[PDB]
Description:
The structure is a homotetramer.
Chain A: H1 2-10, H2 12-29, H3 37-40, H4 42-67, H5 75-88, H6 96-101, H7 108-111, H8 114-124, H9 131-152, H10 157-160, H11 163-174, H12 179-188, H13 195-221
GO molecular function (chain C): identical protein binding; metal ion binding; voltage-gated sodium channel activity
Organism (chain C): Aliarcobacter butzleri (strain RM4018)
Protein name (chain C): Ion transport protein
Amino acid sequence: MYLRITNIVESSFFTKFIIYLIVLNGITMGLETSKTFMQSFGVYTTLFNQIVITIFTIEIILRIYVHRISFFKDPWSLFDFFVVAISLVPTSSGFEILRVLRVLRLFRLVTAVPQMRKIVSALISVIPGMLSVIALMTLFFYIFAIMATQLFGERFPEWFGTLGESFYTLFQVMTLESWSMGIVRPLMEVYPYAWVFFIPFIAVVTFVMINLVVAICVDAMA
Amino acid sequence: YLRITNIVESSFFTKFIIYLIVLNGITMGLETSKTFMQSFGVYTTLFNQIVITIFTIEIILRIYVHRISFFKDPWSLFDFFVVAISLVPTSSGFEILRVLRVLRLFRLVTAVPQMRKIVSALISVIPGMLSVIALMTLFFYIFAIMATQLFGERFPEWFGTLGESFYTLFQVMTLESWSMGIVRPLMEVYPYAWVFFIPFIAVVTFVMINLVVAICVDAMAILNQKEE
Amino acid sequence: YLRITNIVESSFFTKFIIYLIVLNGITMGLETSKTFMQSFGVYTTLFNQIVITIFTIEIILRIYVHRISFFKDPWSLFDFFVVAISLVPTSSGFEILRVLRVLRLFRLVTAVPQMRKIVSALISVIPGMLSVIALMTLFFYIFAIMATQLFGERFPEWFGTLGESFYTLFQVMTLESWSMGIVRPLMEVYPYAWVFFIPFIAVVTFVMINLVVAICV
Amino acid sequence: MYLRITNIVESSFFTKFIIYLIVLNGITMGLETSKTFMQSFGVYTTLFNQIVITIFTIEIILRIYVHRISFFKDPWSLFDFFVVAISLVPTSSGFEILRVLRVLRLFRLVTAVPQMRKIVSALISVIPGMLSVIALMTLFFYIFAIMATQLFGERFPEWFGTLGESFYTLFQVMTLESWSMGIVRPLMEVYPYAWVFFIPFIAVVTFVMINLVVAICVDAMA
């Protein structure tokens, strides 16, 4: 029987069936969006949900006993378990968030489907080349998120009144979203020297933000 | 068969079509003026039908000359569409179609070869990218849903529907007013809204960035492979 | 003839001009100060005319020394233009030419070699793009019209004119307030307005993407 | 004794120990932000700082004589020295600004740690290729900041009423933040041709700022 389950899991029909449950449940999860729906067919789908998660457990379990240790060294299956375990967390009570994170089980179409897996892994293999820069940037923010707070948090509490609020406000300034009209120009009505903080921050941040990309294109071309 | 062809294949023919386009092209940008469309309003409302009726004739003549080859040529199909588009009667129907006639000024992109190359050069990029647009389309969809069932209750205008979440997420992707316009107000009710939109902005920007780093490497691989 | 030529082509000539350039360059940024233009207002409107007075000789020296080479040289044609601009009388006429005088600080791009190349290095890039500036320009034109006759009725400042559409389309291209400022209000009247502006933004940027990759290549 | 002290500095324990205080002072700098803290163990921490900076000074002192003039031809140590010397400047009176500039000594976590230096020096090695264009950019701005002042400072003082404020507003337009809705559209209600000024500026400047990236990608690919 050891092998009876093996031929099930590795069969193309098995993969076909999982993907079918995905694309179907993918649709129907976006239908519990409609209020009209969750009245006419509302009872219908919370159960169909309970159905699909039940099958995936079997499938994810079938994958377990068939692959033994092969299952738990492959990110896609570890993700499958979590993204199933998430939806395995009870519907009732608990926290409302887990009632929502079930939708992550539609990234299982990135698992169950091979062509996406490559696009994904192609992008992630690129990540490590950046980590030397991402770290500095985080320190850089940290050294700046701190200064902003004790420079501007006094009269501008919402934006800089907290290291957390400064980190948010600094990220937004990095994104350049309303940084001047919304944040800096108001700031200067009180501290006319604010442009010495945020202009250098912006230049440094954008400059460094660029090199990261060339650092990527340089890697592949070299 | 050959009597019409030498007319059709003449350099004068290609020269002649382009003339009608820019003619209608200019004049379509002249039917814009209110001053214009009364004194010469009647004058010009005809010239359109003139240009397209000839275009129809042009579109009519061109078919039999190339036979099935006409409907295997992408460039001609748009001429056909935007001639067919412009052929549809003015009255009733939908107001939208009086405007899609103006697409027949992208028919100035068809008859000219120099345009054909630039365009397909841009489009030849699509298939290598298509794998990523798909992943992105999924990514949005999995998030447009969550926003709807997280924020649409108290923020209907932005997230009250999968459609409005899809919009609001696209706008956040473009980074236009994501924080001051959407997240900061969102955080006034869900002080944890930034845990949704900050990662999305990163992931989405992450992906968008790689798409170009996948293209520029694709081309600096032609010149690092011919170099052998 | 060569007596002036050996003067004109001398490095001291180049050095002295650049000195005059940087000099008048500074002084233009002081006609900005209100404090300045009263106490030292007389001082500088003349020094302006002074520096502009010298520049005529230099361009004339450059002319006869370079003969026709001067009027086939963009740098000399440009230098000449920005002197001719500054040659227009200070009083009356149009105030713009008293202001366009400041363009004579791009004459620091001529007399200085490193600038000449950086500028020309940037411009040699242009011809490969003109194929796209054209198609985009057409792309705008075919859309700016449609914007006018769809939204210009109820939204006049933004789309009420082919001209106002071009401006509003440039802004949407840059993505500045494109959604909050333009589309979301537009949608209050035409709930399908997003089918216009998303492809425009997509196509426009996708094109603006390719222009850059084409440059690194 | 000359060499007796020298072997201390390069010891595995020595380098490790400074980085220790850096992250320590690095951490502790981010707690003087919270008001809750500055009472129970706030006093605890006002003291802990003076310890760290005193050691940081000593550390910087040892490095000098051991390296002799070699300390003052090395940018990395001079920053440590400066960013510690900064922290040596008296607390009382003066300007509040210096209570904030202490935190830059957590960029001493970029010095005291070797692995960052390369990524950093890679970014700085990029700078010279831009200076040819960075200058022209600066040239371009100045010629325009003047025009804006003497075109728009009349009715729009906040934005262009001074060469300095025009320079500010021009950078803001360069970043494209609210350039149309925030500045140009209001400008056009009084100067309906203002768009002939800012569209080319935006075009050329963007024309240029992108060339900077080529100038980066080209030069760094050599």
